[PDB]
């Protein structure tokens, strides 16, 4: 059968409702991109450690978020990342 791989943006929204990290990995894995969650910078007080995380998807670096912890940073980035992708397709001519 014909391999039909369409932009299933609706399921990216399901990941916002479930697990953003897995969704960002899913989007990349299906689109031939690599999803790299790296820590950019760590600048924050001892009581509020600020971790700047950025999602490197292929040759793009987006987004850049600053969370209160490492596990948070991954998720905050992935959440925003999917929302970028979704927002890019909504009202898009591309």
Short mmCIF file of N, CA and C in Angstrom, two decimals, residues 15-49:
data_model
loop_
_atom_site.label_atom_id
_atom_site.label_comp_id
_atom_site.label_asym_id
_atom_site.label_seq_id
_atom_site.Cartn_x
_atom_site.Cartn_y
_atom_site.Cartn_z
N UNK A 15 -0.18 15.50 22.37
CA UNK A 15 1.02 15.40 23.19
C UNK A 15 1.12 16.56 24.17
N UNK A 16 0.61 17.72 23.79
CA UNK A 16 0.52 18.84 24.72
C UNK A 16 -0.37 18.46 25.90
N UNK A 17 -1.35 17.62 25.61
CA UNK A 17 -2.31 17.16 26.60
C UNK A 17 -1.77 15.96 27.37
N UNK A 18 -0.74 15.32 26.83
CA UNK A 18 -0.18 14.12 27.44
C UNK A 18 1.29 14.31 27.83
N UNK A 19 2.18 14.17 26.86
CA UNK A 19 3.62 14.30 27.09
C UNK A 19 4.27 15.06 25.95
N UNK A 20 4.63 16.33 26.19
CA UNK A 20 5.23 17.19 25.17
C UNK A 20 6.57 16.67 24.66
N UNK A 21 7.36 16.10 25.57
CA UNK A 21 8.68 15.60 25.23
C UNK A 21 8.58 14.49 24.19
N UNK A 22 7.70 13.53 24.44
CA UNK A 22 7.50 12.43 23.52
C UNK A 22 6.98 12.91 22.18
N UNK A 23 6.19 13.98 22.21
CA UNK A 23 5.63 14.53 20.99
C UNK A 23 6.68 15.20 20.12
N UNK A 24 7.59 15.92 20.76
CA UNK A 24 8.67 16.59 20.04
C UNK A 24 9.59 15.55 19.41
N UNK A 25 9.84 14.48 20.16
CA UNK A 25 10.62 13.36 19.65
C UNK A 25 9.89 12.67 18.50
N UNK A 26 8.57 12.56 18.63
CA UNK A 26 7.73 11.93 17.66
C UNK A 26 7.71 12.72 16.35
N UNK A 27 7.51 14.02 16.46
CA UNK A 27 7.51 14.90 15.30
C UNK A 27 8.82 14.78 14.54
N UNK A 28 9.93 14.85 15.27
CA UNK A 28 11.25 14.81 14.66
C UNK A 28 11.51 13.45 14.02
N UNK A 29 11.20 12.38 14.75
CA UNK A 29 11.49 11.03 14.28
C UNK A 29 10.72 10.72 13.00
N UNK A 30 9.51 11.26 12.90
CA UNK A 30 8.65 11.03 11.75
C UNK A 30 9.03 11.93 10.58
N UNK A 31 9.67 13.06 10.88
CA UNK A 31 9.99 14.05 9.85
C UNK A 31 11.46 14.02 9.47
N UNK A 32 12.21 13.10 10.06
CA UNK A 32 13.61 12.94 9.70
C UNK A 32 14.51 13.96 10.37
N UNK A 33 14.01 14.60 11.42
CA UNK A 33 14.82 15.54 12.18
C UNK A 33 15.31 14.89 13.47
N UNK A 34 16.33 15.48 14.07
CA UNK A 34 16.82 15.02 15.36
C UNK A 34 16.39 15.99 16.45
N UNK A 35 15.92 15.44 17.55
CA UNK A 35 15.47 16.25 18.67
C UNK A 35 16.51 16.25 19.78
N UNK A 36 17.17 17.38 19.96
CA UNK A 36 18.21 17.50 20.96
C UNK A 36 17.83 18.51 22.03
N UNK A 37 17.62 18.01 23.24
CA UNK A 37 17.33 18.87 24.38
C UNK A 37 18.62 19.18 25.12
N UNK A 38 19.16 20.37 24.88
CA UNK A 38 20.41 20.76 25.51
C UNK A 38 20.19 21.91 26.48
N UNK A 39 21.08 22.02 27.45
CA UNK A 39 21.03 23.11 28.40
C UNK A 39 21.93 24.24 27.91
N UNK A 40 21.34 25.41 27.70
CA UNK A 40 22.06 26.55 27.16
C UNK A 40 22.84 27.28 28.24
N UNK A 41 22.16 27.63 29.32
CA UNK A 41 22.77 28.42 30.38
C UNK A 41 22.06 28.20 31.71
N UNK A 42 22.79 28.34 32.80
CA UNK A 42 22.24 28.13 34.13
C UNK A 42 22.51 29.35 35.00
N UNK A 43 21.62 30.33 34.94
CA UNK A 43 21.81 31.57 35.67
C UNK A 43 20.58 31.90 36.52
N UNK A 44 20.66 31.59 37.80
CA UNK A 44 19.57 31.86 38.70
C UNK A 44 19.99 31.73 40.14
N UNK A 45 19.26 32.36 41.07
CA UNK A 45 19.57 32.30 42.50
C UNK A 45 19.53 30.86 43.04
N UNK A 46 20.14 30.62 44.21
CA UNK A 46 20.19 29.27 44.81
C UNK A 46 18.81 28.70 45.11
N UNK A 47 17.87 29.58 45.43
CA UNK A 47 16.51 29.17 45.76
C UNK A 47 15.65 29.05 44.51
N UNK A 48 16.10 29.66 43.42
CA UNK A 48 15.38 29.61 42.15
C UNK A 48 16.35 29.37 40.99
N UNK A 49 16.91 28.15 40.90
CA UNK A 49 17.86 27.82 39.84
C UNK A 49 17.21 27.89 38.46
#
